[PDB]
Structure formats: structure tokens, C-alpha cells
């Protein structure tokens, strides 16, 4: 709703709080009734705009490589680590990190679990191939960047309900926690 001071600015007259409340209650009554187009625009004259745009993860386009295979590319960042992953529509579950198998690139089990989390959550372990390039940061930061990149790329091959579920599970959010000066 239009605030009191900006309503004064539009009217070019000072007004109290109770009369502002009177006006707002009349506007509410007009809204509740079957207000027509003229009444709708009249209300919109006194209704300011605030944009809400959550729920909507930008789904990367599905590209096709020279071999005719469908894939999607995405980026992720965690601390100073930056990852860029290519997820293929079909595959056998092979992840390749900087050209190295994922179990050789990530000796620690925690990082392998982090890489597993996205595909496991949407019940498609062993159905996609991943080729990712990660740079900077350390062990866990690189694992988190790769996880974010794979989730954002995998959003292309899942249903919109599954995309929303991944969003709610925290799998599509860039983690902003970084070292404070």
C-alpha cells in the first residue's frame, strides 16, 4: 500500500494517521468488491510495486555436442574455489574432475559424499556422466563448488517439481560464507 508520506506527496497536503487509515480501509473495501478495470487501475494508482522472484532457478539450455549427445553446462563457487561442470543427459555415472577420476581426485570420503548428494537426492545415481574443471581453493571448497555446479547443470534434466525440491534442500544456493577481515 501507498505509505502515508508519499500519499501526502501525491495529495500535496499534510494528513494525520487516522485519516490515512480511513482511506486505506476504504481502498480495502473497494478491492474486496468485484472491482472493474477502471476501479482496478484506480487502486493501482495507490498500490506500489514490490517484486518477488524466488522459486525460479534459471534452467540452463540443453546443448548438443558434435557426437549428437545432449549436455548442459553450469558454474559454481565456494570460498575461492571455482568449478565448471558439464552434465550429460545419458551416461553411466562417470565423474571426471580435471581429467582425473573422482575417486582419485578426491581421496577423502566426505568430498565423495558431497559429489554424490545431488544425484542421490533426485534418484539418478548412475544415469549421467560429469566432466568438471575446478580451480582454486582447497579440498572441501572444491568439492562444494563441484556439487553446486553439478546441481545447477542437472536442473536441466529433471522435472520442475524436482528442481524446486533441490532448491529447498539447499542444493542450488551459492554459499556466501567467506573469511571475514
Amino acid at each position: 500500500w501507498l505509505i502515508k508520506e508519499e500519499l501526502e506527496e501525491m495529495l500535496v497536503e499534510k494528513l494525520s494517521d487516522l485519516d490515512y487509515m480511513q482511506f486505506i480501509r476504504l481502498l480495502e473495501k473497494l478491492l474486496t468488491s468485484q472491482c472493474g478495470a477502471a476501479e482496478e487501475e484506480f487502486v493501482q494508482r495507490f498500490r506500489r510495486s514490490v517484486t518477488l522472484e524466488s522459486k525460479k532457478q534459471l534452467i540452463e539450455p540443453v546443448q548438443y555436442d558434435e557426437q549428437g549427445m545432449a549436455f548442459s553446462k553450469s558454474e559454481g563457487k565456494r570460498k575461492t574455489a571455482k568449478a565448471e561442470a558439464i552434465v550429460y543427459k545419458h551416461g553411466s555415472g562417470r565423474i571426471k574432475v580435471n581429467g582425473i577420476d573422482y575417486q582419485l581426485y578426491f581421496p577423502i570420503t566426505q568430498d565423495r559424499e558431497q559429489l554424490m548428494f545431488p544425484f542421490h537426492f533426485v534418484d539418478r545415481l548412475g544415469k549421467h556422466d560429469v566432466t568438471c574443471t575446478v580451480s582454486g581453493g582447497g579440498r572441501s571448497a572444491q568439492a562444494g563448488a563441484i556439487r553446486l555446479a553439478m546441481a545447477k547443470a542437472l536442473c536441466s534434466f529433471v522435472t520442475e517439481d524436482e528442481v524446486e525440491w533441490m532448491r529447498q534442500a539447499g542444493l542450488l544456493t551459492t554459499d556466501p560464507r567467506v573469511r571475514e577481515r
Partner: protein
């Protein structure tokens, strides 16, 4: 007792092994007096490499972590100087067995980065682990590749663990548990064994 030496071996001015004695005596001389253990190993090798050529028996030379023989050591002198592998009698005598100058047997060996010295964790190929000297020594040889489990082997390994009741987690028998074990191990036998150990 069947194998018998073909030379006189002198351990000390008092003690010697006379020609024609059973090889066991030599072995015993190394197990009782450790001072002559290393000399007793070489003699054994020198006998086994020779008599097999004569055709008395077939000899299998099985050496695990064979990449150690042509690399570096972490042993030092009293002046803290490095020691080379060829300066060890135990390592010097075992290199002769790797040379294909005898018949009547086979030489089977396995590389291993685990326990190796001055090799990066991801080095597994023959030249990378052996070095130039090691490859030149073993050349010509037949390399045999060992890979991760294929699906049949992985399924049978988990079935063996289930039959021994070694997977106690209630979700391990299920298909989703098997997929998670497969992803986390990537069908690697050692990783799968270590993961299954504490489940």
C-alpha cells in the same frame, strides 16, 4: 632336503657348509646366527637360480612391490649420506633373479605405489613407478592390467560380505545402499572393503 648345494660355503673359519649338504642347513644357518642371514639368502638365491636351470624343479619368483629394486632408499650411513639400492646385498642379490638368464621357471611381479619412496600418489604405470633403470632391467616383459571391479565382480563381492553377515546396516542389503557403496567406492576393491568394514 631334496635340494643340495653344489659348492662349499664358508661362514666362519670354524663353520662351513660342505658340498652336497641339503639346502636346509644354509637356511638354518641364517635363522640361528643372524650375522649370516644376508649371506644365507644370496646363497639360497644363487642355488635356486642354478639348479632350476638343470631341471630339478620349477621355480616361481614372486616379488611384490618390485619397483623398490631400481629406485631410491631412505637408509643412511653414519655420516648421514644416502645409500643406493645396489649397495644393499639383499637388494643386489634379488636383482639377479629378475634377469631372464635362467630357464625352468617364471618371474611374476606386481608394482605398488603404496610404501614406495619418492613417487607421487597417482603414479601407477610401469615406467612411472619403475624408472628408466627399472624399465630397462625388466624389459622385455608382459604387463598385465588390474582394474576396478566390473558390475558382476562388485555384486559378487557385496553378496560375499552379506553371506558373512559383514554388512550390518539395515540399508546395506537394499538396492539404494548398493548404489551408494558403488558410487563412494567407484567399484575399487580396497575402497569398497574399507567402507564395508565399518558398516
Amino acid at each position: 632336503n631334496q635340494i643340495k648345494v653344489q659348492e662349499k660355503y664358508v661362514w666362519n673359519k670354524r663353520e662351513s657348509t660342505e658340498k652336497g649338504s641339503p639346502l636346509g642347513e644354509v637356511v638354518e644357518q641364517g635363522i640361528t646366527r643372524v650375522r649370516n642371514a644376508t649371506d644365507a639368502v644370496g646363497i639360497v638365491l644363487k642355488e635356486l637360480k642354478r639348479q632350476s636351470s638343470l631341471g630339478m624343479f620349477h621355480l616361481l619368483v614372486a616379488v611384490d612391490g618390485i619397483n623398490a629394486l631400481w629406485g631410491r632408499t631412505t637408509l643412511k650411513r653414519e655420516d648421514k649420506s644416502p645409500i643406493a639400492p645396489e649397495e644393499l646385498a639383499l637388494v643386489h642379490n634379488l636383482r639377479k633373479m629378475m634377469k631372464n638368464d635362467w630357464h625352468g621357471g617364471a618371474i611374476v611381479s606386481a608394482l605398488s605405489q603404496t610404501g614406495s619412496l619418492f613417487k607421487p600418489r597417482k603414479a601407477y604405470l610401469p615406467q612411472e613407478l619403475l624408472g628408466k633403470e627399472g624399465f630397462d632391467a625388466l624389459d622385455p616383459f608382459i604387463p598385465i592390467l588390474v582394474s576396478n571391479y566390473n558390475p558382476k565382480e562388485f555384486e559378487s563381492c557385496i553378496q560375499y560380505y552379506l553371506e558373512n553377515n559383514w554388512l550390518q546396516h539395515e540399508k546395506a542389503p537394499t538396492e539404494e545402499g548398493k548404489k551408494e557403496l558403488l558410487f563412494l567406492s567407484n567399484a575399487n576393491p580396497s575402497l569398497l572393503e574399507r567402507h564395508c568394514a565399518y558398516l
